[PDB]
Design a protein around this ligand. Structure first.
Ligand SMILES: CCCCCCCCCCCCCCCCCC(=O)OC[C@H](COP(=O)([O-])OCC(O)COP(=O)([O-])OC[C@@H](COC(=O)CCCCCCCCCCCCCCCCC)OC(=O)CCCCCCCCCCCCCCCCC)OC(=O)CCCCCCCCCCCCCCCCC
Ligand SMILES: CCCCCCCCCCCCCCCCCC(=O)OC[C@H](COP(=O)([O-])OCC(O)COP(=O)([O-])OC[C@@H](COC(=O)CCCCCCCCCCCCCCCCC)OC(=O)CCCCCCCCCCCCCCCCC)OC(=O)CCCCCCCCCCCCCCCCC
Ligand SMILES: CCCCCCCCCCCCCCCCCC(=O)OC[C@H](COP(=O)([O-])OCC(O)COP(=O)([O-])OC[C@@H](COC(=O)CCCCCCCCCCCCCCCCC)OC(=O)CCCCCCCCCCCCCCCCC)OC(=O)CCCCCCCCCCCCCCCCC
Ligand code: BCL
Ligand SMILES: CC[C@H]1c2cc3[nH]c4c(c3C)C(=O)[C@H](C(=O)OC)c4c3nc(cc4[nH]c(cc(n2)[C@@H]1C)c(C(C)=O)c4C)[C@@H](C)[C@@H]3CCC(=O)OC/C=C(/C)CCC[C@H](C)CCC[C@H](C)CCCC(C)C
Ligand SMILES: CC[C@H]1c2cc3[nH]c4c(c3C)C(=O)[C@H](C(=O)OC)c4c3nc(cc4[nH]c(cc(n2)[C@@H]1C)c(C(C)=O)c4C)[C@@H](C)[C@@H]3CCC(=O)OC/C=C(/C)CCC[C@H](C)CCC[C@H](C)CCCC(C)C
Ligand SMILES: COC(C)(C)C/C=C/C(C)=C/C=C/C(C)=C/C=C/C(C)=C/C=C\C=C(C)\C=C\C=C(C)\C=C\C=C(C)\C=C\CC(C)(C)OC
Ligand code: HEC
Ligand SMILES: CCCCCCCCCCCCO[C@@H]1O[C@H](CO)[C@@H](O[C@H]2O[C@H](CO)[C@@H](O)[C@H](O)[C@H]2O)[C@H](O)[C@H]1O
Ligand SMILES: CCCCCCCCCCCCCCCC(=O)O
Ligand SMILES: [Fe+3]
Ligand SMILES: [Mg+2]
Lengths: 47, 46, 274, 278, 318, 333, 46, 46
């Protein structure tokens, strides 16, 4: 067991999930821009 | 089957699972890339 | 003359043969019976080599005592057609074997283990592979290497290219790895001892705790003062042993190009991918 | 011979670079040889070795360098070669007689060579103060005083497969002739190298159960049958193994005394060991 | 029947060793250290902790980028097939630029990735030299290990960077692969006429063979004198015990001369670095001041002359 | 792994290490058995040039000798099909099948090398069986290495190397050695002729050295030889230190280059797509195409003296030095 | 999942997470460079 | 976030960022130099 208490662990988790959410939100926009540039899922006939 | 963690160390199992699944996930994605029909970046006809 | 602490060690006994007859020192050298034998073999071989030099050339690099032709098989050749090489070969084997036996007597007289004679026997085994075991398996003494500083380099070149790429020899790859690893281990061990006992000027001589700490700081593991000498002997002896293996399988146990030996790897059903 | 690298009609850069290394290598061999002569030099040339019949000091080529000074952590400076180690070697009177008067003849011990210190039984002159670690603890110490050490690197191996992770405490000690000398009662460990250095044993088989003696770990064959076999010495010869000045400490001088005694058994343990095969 | 000092029989485990305390400017060591029974059979059983400093971490970052670049180019060369990557593992490589680019920056897929991988790998070994240098200084040791490593880097830089720059093309440098870099080693000897005739290649072999010879001798000597606590070499250097005396006397009685406990490590130290120093010098000499090492050997009278055994071939285009 | 016994033959002076080591258990003993020659056919009557309609190459043969050659050619390149491999039905004089047009070129090539390439094959010559060995296609041909377009900003460019290939004898050496030296005429020499460097006169790269090394690997395994049989590897570029097999194999390189450039490649347009290689080329001749791992093809069985009609006339414009070595007169476009 | 930070040192997890992200992002960008369609520095047309 | 420095050591994090960005900045500049369209020293047509 690490030194962090339940309050400390809960506060870290809340900030971690928010920080992870913002990181994923930026990447989602980056993928929307990438898709608008060149999509990466080909159809049955390819590209 | 929660008794598994009285035998296997949960802290080490979780770390090994992530590393192991990292290798496997890269391995499978790489296998698909090598194929003609499932290289999504190449986009060959199906 | 003797080292100032040598007197109490020059005692009688520990010989394998000869006993009191040859148990004495000439200067710093211990003689023993095998010392007389190794001196006789050494002088005889060297003088025969010098005679072979006289019949060809006295250039130090161009002196060459070549083995007989393969046409002679395992028979003893005439003296100037490889027979001199055969006589020197048995003299060299006698000199090397008596040298290790002499070290065994010196080891016993000093209460030391027989690690040094056994480690040297690995070198003798490698030499015997080159001039006895491999020539025997191939059926002719002419497969041995000539006794010359530069001529035996041409032998190594041509024998290595008999298999079109000797780098692909698996045993040669392992033996080279041990050779490279042991000099890496030697540089590390030699440097570490010197670094501790010759630290930055002014600082005191460090301890064994500094040795373990240093290598655990650099690479995360330290093998210890006893482990490194076991490792150094292990790497050096495997370098000697796998050298003998790589040459013994070249021709008796593999006649094709060494890269072709790796075709088994290319045809493993796990990763054929075709 | 023309082209880049040419220096004369015959000399070229790769040839002169090679001779530059020959000069460097010769100088290095001289330096390395001088480093080889910081222990044991100058050589003692005894009277029988010279026509002048007087002891002489021989330097050799290259001659020994200037003495080297080691700074020690405790606050001392030791000059190598050490004065007292040389002074002891050239002042002691060996209990051995050369087999022949000429130089190079081996010495024949008169008394018991194992206890007198001849040949394989010889010991070096070393400091009598037990070594200490960098932290300041006693360096070599038995498990009773060093309670932080447990026998066996792995608990699971020592528990379920104890053959390859043995605990030799309580085993029996057997001499080179099978004599049961005693029983191991403790293990001495080196706090600097974390290794067992000695096996303390009572002499119950050949003496008292309260007499303690140290058996070096490198002279002991710890078998799989709860036995420790000492091929170095006879079981009865354990009674003459040098004793510790302090029951819980061992000095570098004492270490040489003990390892010297067991090493003396390589030639002197039983009759015939000093004789040849044929 | 005697203890051969090959494997440690009895082991003792104390608390894990944090190590000698560093000055209060170095990074804390890692907190993960364990004991391995298997490694205790050979030597010290403790694994870890490891020091991660500024230079250590930066060297890993440069080294990872080098390995990723090499690995990805290898994987791309087999069409991203992990199965073909295992099958072709010894054969794949990151190829140097072709000769047309000289010393200029080539395109990524035409030797550019090789140059980037070579640059970052060079930075990682240079930073690792500084890491080894600083660890020795932090513990108050000499920098002999760092300078032995620097000698190794010299051959690494001579082979891969210095000599190709002297030749004026990155193409002469060595590919990042197992069998391909053996092919480079052989093609180097073929191109410049039997590198066996390079005197510095001969000398580098002398010290390579002499290093294995010396460590075989020294390793066996210390193990043979292990009865008298010879492996404790620091104590035997500052306070000569009987193990140092017997070890010195063993070789004196054998071959007339001997080293000390300290001096044998100087011999081993210099043999190891001379192998790599002379090797680097010999590689610099070839192509730059010697074209054909055999013809150079003939010029200096070292090439042996063989009597007739066959009918010599005559060049039809001569 | 192999095992003794092994057959050893000395190729250089004693102690040079120049020997050939062979395993007798590896030899097929049937791939190298020359067919029994047909009985001596009488040469009389009119020539096959006038009696038969579409005969261009074998004009000077008689009718009986012409039939004997056809039966032998059938059993050499297509014994399991018969006459219909090159001739359609009851129209033997019809040149329609692609195998007919190829075989007509093959006869001319067979006659050409038998007459002009004695500098390599001496008096043995070749025959349809020498390359085909009773099969429709020789088992030891080669296709040109594919030249995939590169990204120049991507990853994984194998510059013809770094892949285990049967062409390179399972090395990572360049895989395009055949195109460079057995179809092209790139210089094989890698060593300088001087003690000291002349970088503006001789700066052969290590990629070309490996390409030469790759071809030499093939030349060794294709003929059952090794580096020693043609070289003293200690002094590699010295011809006087090399056995005569190097001089003979010198002409073998130029003969193989002559066959591919002048006789095989002109057959690419008529070849079917099933016969073509990955790049779209016709299978080309290599050293193993005639040798099959033996220094003497078909154990050196001279079986071209029993077959007149496979021997042409000595071309008066043949030089063997006009195939890329000081001249390109003997090579096409 | 908040109990995860009591088990593992959050500092070590972040280093492990960040190191994986840096390595993975370097690999994914390199994969795109190898393709003709997604090589942005190559300026390849679709 | 100011609380990041109670989890991560600020002294070590600054060093890691600087040496980390040094590797990345060198890599990207080298990649651009190893391209035709963005080698500003070569000056190829765009
Ligand atoms: C780069 C690579 C190529 C180069 C490599 C290097 C070159 C090739 C390798 C050669 C290297 C070693 C060459 C010398 C071997 C050692 C001989 C020797 O004693 O040298 C001592 C010499 C130093 O001598 P010292 O200990 O200072 O002697 C002090 C006084 O001379 C003390 O005086 P003393 O009392 O000792 O005087 C003794 C005197 C007195 O003699 C008598 O009175 C005889 C009475 C008879 C009755 O003569 C003798 O007793 C000895 C004569 C020979 C006896 C032979 C007996 C044979 C018995 C069986 C032994 C078999 C071997 O050390 C060396 O010269 C060798 C080391 C340097 C080279 C090391 C290797 C470098 C490798 C780099 C690669
Ligand atoms: C290095 C850093 C990692 C580390 O220190 O691991 C400790 C690890 C285990 O500690 P140990 O004190 O050696 O274990 C005592 C016995 O080996 C007994 O160990 P155990 O039976 O508890 O080990 C179970 C086994 C688990 O393996 C399996 O259950 C089967 C897996 C394959 C099927 O663990 C291993 O696979 C690693 C040891 C393998 C040794 C023989 C390798 C051949 O030590 C090493 O593996 C050092 C490897 C040196 C090379
Ligand atoms: C150009 C091509 C080569 C390029 C190489 C680049 C990389 C260089 C790495 C190679 C260096 C390896 C040796 C380093 C070393 O010995 O470290 C000790 C030492 C440790 O220092 P520390 O821990 O602060 O000192 C602690 C105490 O001082 C306590 O320290 P200590 O007592 O252990 O140190 C004392 C030691 C001091 O050692 C040194 O100072 C090292 C010697 C510096 C020169 C390195 C020679 C190797 C370079 C190539 C040699 C071949 C050149 C030939 C050129 C044409 C071929 O005593 C010596 O002098 C031993 C060497 C004896 C050489 C005798 C030569 C005689 C020549 C006669 C010619 C006659 C004609 O490292 C240095 O002193 C660094 C100085 C610079 C080293 C070279 C860079
Ligand atoms: C046909 C082949 C040729 C030949 C061609 C060459 C060529 C070319 C060279 C040698 C070299 C050497 N040859 Mg040679 N050599 C031949 C035959 C031999 C024979 C023999 C018995 O036949 C022997 C014993 C040798 C032995 C030697 C050595 C003396 C020398 C290599 C020293 C060394 O340790 O480098 C190994 C050590 C290093 C290269 C330094 C390593 C240090 C660096 C920093 C390591 C970094 C590790 C890195 C961080 C790991 C991660 C990287 C990523 C994972 C990628 N050669 C024949 C004649 N040889 C080398 C030399 O020095 O020439 C004079 C050399 O360049
Ligand atoms: C197996 C691990 C390595 C190793 C180990 C090793 N070598 C050893 C030992 C050990 C443990 C010794 O104890 C022993 C020793 O005492 O060293 C100082 C020795 C030794 N290793 C030596 C050399 C040596 N070791 C080599 C290699 C190696 N030695 C391995 C790499 C090589 C190489 C690779 O070439 C050489 C040259 C000696 C310095 C010494 C043993 C000396 C000896 O036995 O001398 C006897 C007396 C003589 C004068 C010999 C005369 C022999 C003949 C009568 C004449 C010459 C014949 C010979 C075939 C000529 C060849 C010439 C051409 C090849 C140029
Ligand atoms: C005297 C010359 C000989 C010599 C000497 C020598 N080598 C040396 C040294 C010395 C004195 C060192 O001090 C140094 C060393 O560290 O030794 C232990 C080293 C060294 N010699 C090495 C190799 C080496 N030496 C060789 C040769 C030689 N070394 C010569 C024979 C060779 C050969 C024969 O080719 C090799 C391959 C290294 C092991 C080491 C130098 C280490 C180095 O440079 O590190 C940085 C380089 C990198 C590529 C970085 C790698 C980073 C990792 C891939 C990170 C892994 C990921 C992650 C961080 C791990 C954790 C995973 C998580 C999931 C938890
Ligand atoms: C896909 O793979 C993943 C990502 C999963 C991980 C796998 C990685 C793998 C499998 C990696 C495998 C690596 C292997 C097998 C590597 C083999 C390496 C070998 C054997 C190398 C041997 C020799 C190489 C040498 C000696 C190279 C030397 C190169 C040098 C010294 C280059 C120097 C370049 C410099 C200094 C560049 C300077 C750039 C400047 C700016 C000067 O240029 C203008
Ligand atoms: C080696 C130098 C050859 C000699 C001599 C002869 N042939 Fe050949 N032939 C050779 C090759 C390399 C090939 C191509 C193989 C491939 O895979 O494409 C051929 C091809 C033919 C063919 C066409 C076979 C087919 O495509 O079905 C025929 C009909 C043929 N060869 C006949 C032939 C005859 C009759 C020969 C003797 C006169 C002859 N060939 C000699 C190589 C060589
Ligand atoms: C066990 C192998 O022992 C070894 O076997 C081989 C092959 O049988 C023998 O070799 C024998 O046959 C080979 C056949 O190539 C002959 O060239 C050689 O002259 C002859 O000695 C060795 O002489 C023998 O020592
Ligand atoms: C590791 C053990 C590797 C064994 C490889 C066997 C190869 C067998 C085929 C070639 C022969 O030899
Ligand atoms: Fe040591
Ligand atoms: Mg290559």
């Amino acid at each position: 067991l690490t030194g962090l208490s339940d309050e400390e662990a809960k506060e870290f988790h809340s900030i971690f999930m928010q920080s992870f959410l913002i990181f994923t939100a930026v990447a989602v926009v980056a993928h929307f821009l990438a898709w608008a540039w060149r999509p990466w899922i080909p159809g049955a006939e390819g590209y | 089957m929660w008794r598994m963690w009285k035998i296997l160390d949960y802290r080490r199992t979780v770390v090994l699972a992530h590393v192991g699944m990292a290798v496997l996930a890269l391995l499978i994605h790489f296998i698909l890339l090598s194929t003609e029909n499932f290289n999504w970046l190449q986009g060959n006809p199906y | 003359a003797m080292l100032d602490f040598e007197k109490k060690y020059r005692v009688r006994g520990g010989t394998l043969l000869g006993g009191d007859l040859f148990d004495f020192w000439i200067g710093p050298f211990y003689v023993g019976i095998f010392g007389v034998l190794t001196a006789i073999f050494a002088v005889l071989g060297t003088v025969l080599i010098i005679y072979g030099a006289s019949q060809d050339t006295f250039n130090l690099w161009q002196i060459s005592i070549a083995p007989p032709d393969l046409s002679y098989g395992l028979a003893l050749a005439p003296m100037m057609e490889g027979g001199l090489w055969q006589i020197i070969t048995v003299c060299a084997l006698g000199a090397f074997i008596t040298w290790a036996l002499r070290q065994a007597e010196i080891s016993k007289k000093l209460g030391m283990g027989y690690h040094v004679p056994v480690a040297f026997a690995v070198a003798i085994l490698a030499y015997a592979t080159l001039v006895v075991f491999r020539p025997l398996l191939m059926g002719a003494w002419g497969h041995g290497f000539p006794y010359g500083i530069l001529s035996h380099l041409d032998w190594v070149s041509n024998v290595g290219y008999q298999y079109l790429h000797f780098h692909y020899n698996p045993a040669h790859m392992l033996a080279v790895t041990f050779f490279f690893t042991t000099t890496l281990a030697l540089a590390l061990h030699g440097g570490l001892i010197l670094s501790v006992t010759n630290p930055k000027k002014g600082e005191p001589v460090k301890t064994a705790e500094h040795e373990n700490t240093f290598f655990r700081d650099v690479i995360g593991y330290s093998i210890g003062s006893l482990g490194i000498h076991r490792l150094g002997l292990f790497l050096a002896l495997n370098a000697g042993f796998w050298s003998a293996v790589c040459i013994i399988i070249s021709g008796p146990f593999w006649t094709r190009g060494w890269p072709e030996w790796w075709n088994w790897w290319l045809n493993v059903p796990i990763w054929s991918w075709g | 011979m023309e082209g880049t690298g040419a220096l004369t009609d015959y000399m070229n850069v790769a040839q002169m670079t090679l001779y530059a290394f020959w000069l460097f290598l010769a100088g290095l061999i001289v330096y390395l040889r001088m480093e080889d002569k910081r222990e044991g030099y100058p050589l003692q040339a005894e009277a029988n070795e010279n026509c002048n019949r007087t002891p002489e000091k021989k330097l050799g080529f290259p001659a020994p360098p200037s003495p080297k000074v080691f700074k020690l952590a405790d606050g001392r400076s030791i000059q190598v070669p050490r004065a007292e180690k040389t002074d002891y070697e050239l002042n002691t009177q060996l209990r051995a007689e050369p087999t022949a008067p000429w130089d190079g003849a081996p010495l024949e011990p008169t008394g018991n060579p194992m206890v007198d210190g001849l040949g394989p039984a010889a010991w070096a002159k070393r400091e009598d103060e037990p070594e200490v670690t960098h932290g300041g603890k006693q360096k070599i110490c038995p498990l009773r005083v060093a309670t932080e050490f447990e026998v066996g690197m792995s608990r699971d191996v020592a528990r379920f497969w104890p053959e390859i992770d043995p605990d030799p405490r309580g085993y029996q000690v057997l001499g080179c002739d099978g004599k049961v000398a005693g029983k191991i009662v403790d293990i001495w460990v080196d706090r600097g190298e974390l290794r067992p250095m000695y096996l303390e044993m009572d002499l119950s088989g050949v003496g008292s159960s309260g007499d303690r003696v140290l058996l070096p770990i490198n002279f002991a064959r710890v078998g799989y049958d709860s036995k420790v076999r000492v091929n170095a010495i006879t079981g009865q010869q354990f009674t003459d193994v040098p004793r510790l000045r302090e029951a819980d400490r061992i000095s570098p001088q004492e270490e040489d005394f003990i390892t010297g005694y067991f090493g003396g058994g390589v030639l002197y343990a039983v009759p015939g060991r000093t004789e040849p095969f044929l | 029947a005697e203890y051969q000092n090959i494997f440690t029989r009895v082991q003792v485990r104390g608390p894990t060793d944090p190590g000698v305390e560093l000055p209060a400017a170095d990074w804390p060591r890692t907190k993960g250290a364990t004991h391995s029974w298997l490694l205790g059979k050979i030597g010290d059983a403790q694994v870890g902790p490891i020091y991660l400093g500024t230079t250590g971490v930066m060297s890993i970052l440069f080294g990872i980028v080098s390995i990723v670049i090499i690995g990805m180019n290898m994987l791309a060369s087999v069409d991203w097939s992990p199965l073909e990557f295992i099958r072709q593992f010894f054969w794949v490589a990151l190829e140097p630029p072709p000769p047309e680019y000289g010393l200029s920056l080539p395109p990524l897929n035409d030797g550019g990735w090789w140059l980037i991988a070579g640059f970052t790998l060079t930075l990682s070994v240079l930073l690792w030299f500084a890491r080894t240098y600083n660890r020795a200084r932090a513990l108050g040791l000499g920098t002999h290990v760092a300078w032995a490593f620097a000698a190794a880097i010299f051959l690494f830089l001579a082979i891969g960077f210095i000599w190709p720059v002297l030749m004026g093309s990155w193409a002469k440098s060595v590919p990042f692969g197992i069998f391909p870099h053996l092919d480079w080693t052989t093609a180097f000897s073929l191109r410049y006429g039997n590198l066996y005739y390079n005197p510095f290649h001969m000398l580098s072999i002398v010290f390579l063979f002499g290093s294995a010879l010396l460590f075989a001798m020294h390793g066996a000597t210390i193990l043979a004198a292990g009865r008298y606590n010879a492996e404790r070499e620091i104590e035997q250097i500052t306070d000569r015990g009987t193990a140092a005396e017997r070890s010195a006397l063993f070789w004196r009685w054998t071959m007339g001369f001997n080293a000390t406990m300290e001096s044998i490590h100087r011999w081993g130290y210099w043999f190891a670095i001379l192998c790599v120093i002379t090797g680097g010098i010999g590689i610099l000499l070839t192509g730059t001041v010697v074209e054909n090492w055999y013809l150079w050997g003939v010029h200096h009278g070292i090439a042996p002359e063989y009597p007739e055994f066959f009918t010599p071939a005559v060049d039809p285009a001569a | 792994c192999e095992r003794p016994p092994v057959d050893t033959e000395q190729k250089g002076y004693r102690g040079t290490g120049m020997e050939e080591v062979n395993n007798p258990r590896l030899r097929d003993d049937d791939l190298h058995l020359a067919p029994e020659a047909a009985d001596p056919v009488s040469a009389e009557g009119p020539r096959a040039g006038e009696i038969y309609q579409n005969v261009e190459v074998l004009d000077d043969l008689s009718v009986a000798e012409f039939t004997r050659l056809m039966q032998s050619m059938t059993d050499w390149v297509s014994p399991d099909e018969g006459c219909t491999y090159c001739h359609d039905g009851n129209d033997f004089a019809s040149e329609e099948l692609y195998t007919y047009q190829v075989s007509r070129q093959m006869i001319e090539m067979n006659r050409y090398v038998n007459a002009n390439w004695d500098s390599h094959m001496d008096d043995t010559g070749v025959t349809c069986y020498t390359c085909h060995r009773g099969e429709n296609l020789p088992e030891e041909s080669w296709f040109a290495e594919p030249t995939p377009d590169v990204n120049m900003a991507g990853l994984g460019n194998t510059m013809m190397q770094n892949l285990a290939s049967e062409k390179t004898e399972y090395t990572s050496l360049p895989r395009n050695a055949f195109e460079r030296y057995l179809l092209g005429h790139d210089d094989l020499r890698v060593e300088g002729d001087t003690i000291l460097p002349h970088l503006d006169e001789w700066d052969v790269s290590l990629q070309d050295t490996e390409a030469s090394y790759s071809l030499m690997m093939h030349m060794s395994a294709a003929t059952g030889s090794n580096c020693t049989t043609c070289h003293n590897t200690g002094r590699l570029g010295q011809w006087d230190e090399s056995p005569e097999e190097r001089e003979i194999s010198w002409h073998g390189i130029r003969m193989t280059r002559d066959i591919n450039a002048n006789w095989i490649e002109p057959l690419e347009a008529g070849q079917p797509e099933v016969r073509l290689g990955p790049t779209g080329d016709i299978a080309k001749v290599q050293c193993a195409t005639c040798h099959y791992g033996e220094q003497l093809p078909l154990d050196g069985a001279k079986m071209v003296d029993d077959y007149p009609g496979l021997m042409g006339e000595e071309d008066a414009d043949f030089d063997f030095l006009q195939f890329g070595d000081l001249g390109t007169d003997g090579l096409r476009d | 999942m908040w109990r995860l930070w009591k088990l593992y040192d959050p500092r070590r997890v972040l280093i492990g997470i960040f190191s994986w992200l840096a390595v993975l992002a370097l690999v994914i960008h390199f994969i795109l460079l190898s393709t003709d369609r997604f090589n942005w520095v190559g300026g390849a047309a679709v």
